[PDB]
Paper text:
After their arrival in the periplasmic space, the OMPs are taken up by periplasmic chaperones SurA and Skp (seventeen kilodalton protein) and subsequently transported across the periplasm to the OM. The insertase for folding and insertion of OMPs into the OM is the essential OMP β-barrel assembly machinery (BAM). BAM is a multicomponent complex consisting of five different subunits, the integral membrane protein BamA and the lipoproteins BamB, BamC, BamD, and BamE, which are anchored to the inner leaflet of the OM. SurA bound to BAM can undergo a large swinging motion between two states.
Under these conditions, the BamA barrel is in the outward-open state. In this swing-in state, SurA and BAM form two key interaction interfaces: Interface I is located between the core domain of SurA and the polypeptide-transport-associated domain 1 (POTRA1) and POTRA2 domains of BamA. This interface is formed by full β strand complementation via backbone hydrogen bonding between the β sheet of POTRA1, specifically the β strand V75 to R79 and the N-terminal β strand of SurA (Q23 to V28). An additional prominent interaction includes a salt bridge between R64 of POTRA1 and D41 of SurA. Interface II is formed between the SurA core domain and BamB. It primarily involves hydrogen bonding between the SurA residues R404, E408, and Q155 with BamB residues Q276, Q230, and M226. In the outward-open conformation of BAM, a salt-bridge forms between D29 of BamD and R162 of BamA. In the swing-in state, this orientation is disrupted and replaced by a salt bridge between D29 of BamD and R271 of the C-terminal helix grip domain of BamC.
Numbering used by the authors:
A (entry chain E): 24 to 111
B (entry chain D): 26 to 243
C (entry chain C): 25 to 342
D (entry chain A): 100 to 810
The structure:
């Protein structure tokens, strides 16, 4: 291994520092979607949570992931921001 | 090539050939009888026999065209449920291969377009005419088609699990849960979703999926 | 290479779909829900009384045939009804009785005054069926309102010497009896019509009057059938022997043959000068008139002068 | 009836558009309409005076038959094409680029002076582009007049234009919502000082900006250029307004038409991940990889915006499956000296699983050849391949005695390939072969090799034997960038193969081969191509041994040099006198034998050599007479092939009188025509070649028929 060519497996939705800073508590779901774009992954079970995961795997270079979890209430108003810059 | 005998003789010959099982000559006789006498006492019976012969003769596109023509021309014919069932059969037949069937190849990974069309047609027949004599076979075929379509989604999710595309795996399994919750393929796919959640280090979602799996261990 | 009689009535495929695993719902653990189902692939819960697999007849249902007359015909469960041209007064019953006797079908009960009768067991012969069926029927003639119609009721069916209850066979054989009676009546009617047509000889006068397309046509003052039948002989007289023809399409083709001046005055009312290539002809249907259209081998239509030469008489040849 | 140019198919489709179709009713009021429409069509082509008149004949049971009598005239021919107002260029130069031709040179018999409205509109567009690409920036077509002689066979064309002045680009100013890629956009809007304005350059710049934005997920940007003209100094300043828009994400990737191929077989070739931001370059790469696979006749892509979503799309790849396989089969003997049969099964996509499975063999009274090969192109997700091969060849002569040239061979081979780039891929493997020769007819080359191996067989009697077990390490490298998989129209493929006997084998040697095939399109439609193909090969012993004579290279045939008998080019055998093991009544014995002379008389039996080099230049042209619907199922070409095989170890000092087979100068050549057809039994190749250059002993064969891909 380490010699077989592997393409880049980009997964998730693109996140930038400015974009992540553009969202603050009390934001409506539509405003968050406008600022960051429609998430590619939500919580299908009994919770109104949005997952903005940003994966990049260049291939034999290590995988880097930033995951932003946005928890809304029933009304659709943003209630909690949880930004994880890197994997553990 | 079809003689111009009176209509009764042509219909009798076509019926005799259909009974004998020679699909091609019966098809020729019925086509002659239909394109010579377009609107007569034989129109409906000849169209139904043409649909049946096209199906048995493996002329599936012609069978579909004839079925569409009959449905649009006679939307309220008493024997309309039979035409819907035949359309379902034709679409299900387009989703089969003999060479691969001989070798025992599971074709659930191939194009599911025709399976989807057959499912739509059979669902239409079952909902519209619950008391028809083709409803039980239609229901059995619907169950089989649902299982096959779920297996197709399972195949895609499994491939993306192999590739390392975790978001794609999660989305595919979520779509399976929303569309085919009660199939075996969804039960098989549930651990794939848990693994995809684990790899992305979202442990809460993985725990939720693990709880779902445990509650439905079987 | 090897086949069996039963491949005719079964579906093209296999019974694999009958072994598909059943669908079981998923239990939602406490404290959370499962994703909301789309409902696009929801299977309604129906009854499993009908046949499945190879035991289901996909043979098209037998629709009653309105052969004798174009009036309404309809089947409902176990009885078929067929209206007839007007009501034929009281002659419909004797006509149906005579057509019934044509097939030497036995009758046990008779209600000629009430227009009702019953038939003894009748044997059927179908290559489709592995085992031949049989059953009893009841035929009556009653007025449905402004017209007189014939109704048939299938008492029962029997195959392999055992009773049957499937609606498919019942409908099939009720329609079989109705179609047999109707085909007999229609055969009598069309024989009478053919005799009348043969008796009614038509004149063979020809004309060159054109139509909405603007071309002249070798019109003949007669119905389509007789003029079409006599046109091959007339074309043979002029040497344009027919090689291909289509009664239901009207199109026909001829071939050149050299005829001298004496031959042209013998029959054919002289030479139009068409002396090259394969020509084609078309006929019309006007119950007293009939247009004959000619086209050149190049694909064009003959001018009025070209065909006026034949129009001189063009009558003895027919 | 009567139509000589317009086919019945196009007419019939024109009928259905107007509602005239078999089984439907006859709308009399539309008759005039249809007629006029057809006449209009005939006028568009330039066939004025044509008439199309409909006749309705009444058929019984209230039916009609519609006959459309076509009477076409003589097509009008362009007498002149005049441009008025061209002072900078000349009419001849401007119309030389036109599709419509005012005149045709006597040598050119493939074009005519026929007229067509669509061609005229395209011609006006071409003229406008010609004048706008030279920096005029003000060219305007004031009017266009199409005249016609009173006899309606002399159509005339005239174009009144105004050139204006020649402008120069002062500078491109790009502004708008550039989405942070301004720096990479300024490099696409770089202009040389004082360069003349150019419309095509501006269009290319807009397309480049759109493509650059698309590579980052901005699938739907809007780029519009509004040049501001300044006549005071005749300078134009471009103003490119750019709005990137929203960044798009792929939601699902769907495959349609793969009724046989597995879904994973198509998905594994995708560079665009499903749940990730869109990249148009990645989608194009996936499409190109699918095309290069060769499993599908056609491949198309469709990016469909998800309804009710401003950020998500669905990429749909629509494929048309192709017959990937050959079934070569034949019988040679029938009833002469027993029975024989052959097999040729070869599948590149076995049951849609992606496996390459090929089994072929020949059973005769003297031969029992069998060969099986199975390779999985994706033994690992990344594309690591794992192949395997078994073969068993036998030669016994069906005599079960001596003096029969018994030759029994059998071996195994395992290969492992893996990519290193998007196009390059290496291969490493291990092979084992066992060869047992016996009762060999003495010859100079074979005896020389045997002496190199340390054996000392008698030169007179045929009694002899030789057993060798060889273990080889095989290596290879393939660079593949072909446009397609079966009928390439662009790109090059290079395949290098080689083997070396690892210590411990009976005989030590090395061998290497190098193929090459380059397709260069000259036509923009990729219908006329130039194919440069070559093949090279060299082998030799390592120690004091020599390369085995059964590993020699052979040339000449339907795969190397068309026009020569298979494996006929190269050195010819030279037989020593036998003086024993001779069958007087057989009469099949060679010159050097007891029945014949007692010298080293040279024969005509090709033995091959340890060095080979063949080249070939081909011109691919469209099939002269074939419907365009089956254009990609048949290929016609004109080829010129060259080839030579020589034995570097041939000792010219000895055997001076006999030909020197170590000279690579003797180059055979051939020229002819070849036709390839993708029949149900795979590719069938017919070729007629004349070998205008040949040497003594070369058996010519002008007409050749072959089954399966030649190369």
């Amino acid at each position: 291994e380490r010699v077989v060519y592997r393409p880049d497996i980009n997964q998730g939705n693109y996140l930038t520092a400015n974009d992540v800073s553009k969202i603050r508590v009390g934001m409506t779901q539509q405003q968050v979607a406008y600022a960051l774009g429609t998430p590619l992954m939500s919580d299908p079970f009994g919770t109104n949570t949005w997952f903005y995961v940003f994966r990049q795997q260049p291939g034999h270079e290590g995988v880097t992931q930033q995951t932003l979890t946005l928890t809304f209430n029933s009304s659709g108003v943003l209630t909690n921001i949880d930004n994880k810059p890197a994997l553990s | 090539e079809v003689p111009d005998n009176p209509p009764n003789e042509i219909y009798a010959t076509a019926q005799q050939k259909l009974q004998d099982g020679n699909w091609r000559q019966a098809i020729t006789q019925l086509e002659a009888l239909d394109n010579r006498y377009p609107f007569g006492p034989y129109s409906q019976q000849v169209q139904l026999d043409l649909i049946y012969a096209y199906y048995k003769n493996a002329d599936l596109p012609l069978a579909q065209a004839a079925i569409d023509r009959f449905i649009r021309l006679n939307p309220t014919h008493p024997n309309i449920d039979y035409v819907m069932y035949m359309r379902g059969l034709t679409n299900m037949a387009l989703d089969d291969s003999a060479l691969q069937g001989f070798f025992g190849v599971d074709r659930s990974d191939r194009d599911p377009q025709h399976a989807r069309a057959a499912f739509s047609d059979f669902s239409k027949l079952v909902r519209g005419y619950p008391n028809s004599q083709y409803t039980t076979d239609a229901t059995k075929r619907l169950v089989f088609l649902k299982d096959r379509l779920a297996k197709y989604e399972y195949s895609v999710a499994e491939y993306y699990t192999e590739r390392g595309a975790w978001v794609a795996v999660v989305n595919r399994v979520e779509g399976m849960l929303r569309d085919y919750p009660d199939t075996q393929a969804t039960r098989d796919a549930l651990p794939l979703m848990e693994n995809a959640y684990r790899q992305m280090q979202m442990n809460a979602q993985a725990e939720k999926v693990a709880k779902i799996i445990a509650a439905n261990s079987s | 290479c090897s086949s069996d009689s039963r491949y005719k009535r079964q579906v093209s495929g296999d019974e694999a779909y009958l072994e598909a695993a059943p669908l079981a719902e998923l239990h939602a653990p406490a404290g959370m829900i499962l994703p909301v189902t789309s409902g696009d692939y929801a299977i309604p819960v129906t009854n499993g009384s009908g046949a499945v697999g190879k035991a289901l007849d996909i043979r098209p249902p037998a629709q009653p045939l309105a052969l004798v007359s174009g009036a309404r015909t309809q089947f409902t469960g176990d009885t078929a009804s067929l209206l007839v041209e007007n009501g034929r007064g009281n002659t419909l019953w004797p006509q149906v009785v005579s057509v019934l006797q044509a097939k030497n079908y036995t009758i046990t009960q008779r209600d000629d005054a009430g227009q009702t009768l019953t038939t003894d067991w009748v044997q059927w012969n179908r290559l489709d069926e592995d085992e031949q069926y049989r059953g009893r029927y009841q035929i009556s003639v009653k007025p449905q309102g402004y017209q007189q119609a014939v109704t048939v009721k299938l008492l029962n069916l029997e195959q392999a010497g055992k009773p049957v209850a499937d609606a498919a066979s019942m409908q099939r054989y009720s329609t079989e009896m109705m179609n047999v009676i109707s085909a007999g009546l229609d055969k009598s009617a069309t024989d009478a019509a053919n005799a009348a047509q043969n008796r009614a000889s038509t004149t063979m006068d020809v004309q060159s009057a054109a139509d909405d397309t603007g071309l002249p046509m070798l019109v003949v003052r007669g119905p389509f059938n007789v003029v079409w039948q006599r046109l091959p002989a007339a074309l043979e007289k002029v040497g344009m022997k027919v090689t291909d023809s289509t009664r239901s399409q009207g199109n026909m083709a001829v071939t050149y043959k050299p005829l001298s001046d004496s031959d042209w005055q013998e029959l054919g009312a002289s030479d139009p000068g068409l002396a090259s290539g394969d020509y084609k002809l078309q006929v019309g249907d006007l119950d007293n008139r009939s247009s004959l259209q000619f086209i050149d081998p190049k694909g064009h239509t003959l001018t009025q002068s070209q065909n006026d030469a034949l129009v001189a008489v063009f009558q003895a040849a027919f | 009836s009567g139509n000589k140019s317009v086919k019945d198919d196009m007419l019939k489709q024109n009928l259905e558009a107007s509602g005239v179709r078999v089984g439907e009713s006859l709308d009399r009021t539309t008759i005039a309409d249809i007629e006029k429409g057809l006449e209009d069509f005939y006028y568009s082509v330039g066939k004025y005076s044509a008439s199309v008149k409909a006749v309705v004949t009444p058929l019984p049971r209230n039916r009609v038959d519609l006959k459309l009598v076509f009477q076409e005239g003589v097509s009008a021919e362009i007498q002149q094409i005049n441009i008025v107002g061209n002072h900078a260029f000349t009419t001849d130069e401007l119309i030389s680029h036109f599709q419509l031709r005012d005149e045709v040179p006597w040598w050119n018999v493939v074009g005519d002076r026929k007229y067509q409205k669509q061609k005229l509109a395209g011609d006006l567009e071409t003229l406008r582009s010609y004048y706008l690409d030279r920096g005029y920036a003000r060219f305007n077509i004031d009017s266009t007049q199409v005249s016609l002689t009173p006899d309606k066979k002399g159509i005339y064309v005239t174009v009144n234009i105004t050139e204006g002045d020649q402008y120069k680009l002062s500078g491109v100013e790009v502004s708008g919502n550039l989405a942070g890629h301004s720096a990479e956009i300024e490099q696409l809007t770089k202009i040389e000082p004082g360069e003349l304005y150019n419309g095509t350059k501006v269009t290319k710049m807009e397309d480049d900006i759109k493509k650059l934005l698309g590579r980052y997920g901005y699938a739907y940007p809007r780029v519009q250029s509004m040049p501001e003209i300044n006549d005071a100094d005749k300078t134009v300043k471009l103003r490119v307004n750019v709005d990137a828009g929203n960044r798009f994400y792929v939601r699902k990737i769907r495959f349609e038409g793969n009724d046989t191929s597995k879904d994973a077989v198509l998905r594994r070739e995708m560079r665009q991940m499903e749940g990730a931001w869109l990249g148009s370059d990645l989608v194009d790469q996936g499409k190109e990889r699918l095309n290069r696979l060769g499993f599908f006749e056609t491949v198309d892509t469709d990016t469909q915006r998800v309804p009710g979503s401003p950020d998500q799309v669905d990429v749909v790849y629509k494929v048309k499956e192709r017959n990937t396989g050959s079934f070569n089969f034949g019988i040679g003997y029938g009833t002469e000296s027993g029975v024989s049969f052959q097999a040729g099964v070869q599948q590149d996509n076995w049951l849609g699983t992606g496996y390459a499975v090929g089994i072929n063999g020949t059973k005769n009274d003297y031969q029992t050849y069998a060969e099986l090969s199975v390779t999985n192109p994706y033994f690992t997700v990344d594309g690591v391949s794992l192949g395997g091969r078994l073969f068993y060849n036998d030669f016994q002569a069906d005599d079960a005695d001596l003096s029969d040239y018994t030759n029994k061979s059998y071996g195994t081979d395992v290969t492992l390939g893996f990519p290193i780039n998007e196009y390059n891929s290496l291969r490493a493997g291990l092979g084992y072969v066992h060869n047992s020769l016996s009762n060999m007819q003495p010859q100079v080359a074979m005896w020389r090799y045997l002496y190199s191996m340390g054996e000392h067989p008698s030169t007179s009697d045929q009694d002899n034997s030789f057993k060798t077990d060889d273990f080889t390490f095989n290596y290879g490298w393939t660079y593949n960038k072909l446009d397609r998989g079966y009928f390439p129209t662009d790109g090059s493929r290079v395949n290098l193969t080689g083997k070396v006997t690892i210590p411990g084998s009976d005989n030590e040697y090395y061998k290497v081969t190098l193929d090459t095939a380059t397709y260069v399109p000259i036509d923009d439609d990729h219908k006329w191509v130039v194919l440069g193909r070559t093949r090279w090969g060299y082998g030799d012993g390592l120690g004091g041994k020599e390369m085995p004579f059964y590993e020699n290279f052979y040339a000449g045939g339907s795969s190397t040099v068309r026009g020569f008998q298979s494996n006929t080019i190269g050195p010819k055998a030279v037989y020593f006198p036998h003086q024993a093991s001779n069958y007087d009544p057989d009469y099949d014995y060679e010159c050097a034998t007891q029945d014949g002379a007692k010298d080293l008389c040279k024969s005509d039996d090709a033995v091959g050599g340890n060095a080979m080099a063949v080249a070939s230049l081909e011109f691919i042209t469209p099939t002269p007479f074939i419907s365009d619907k089956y254009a990609n199922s048949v290929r016609t070409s004109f080829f010129w092939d060259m080839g030579t095989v020589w034995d570097t170890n041939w000792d010219s000092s000895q055997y001076s009188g006999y030909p020197d087979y170590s000279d690579p100068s003797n180059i055979r050549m051939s020229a002819g025509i070849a036709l390839q057809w993708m029949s149900p039994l795979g590719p069938l190749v017919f070729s007629y070649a004349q070998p205008f250059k040949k040497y003594d002993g070369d058996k010519a064969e002008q007409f050749q028929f072959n089954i399966g891909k030649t190369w």
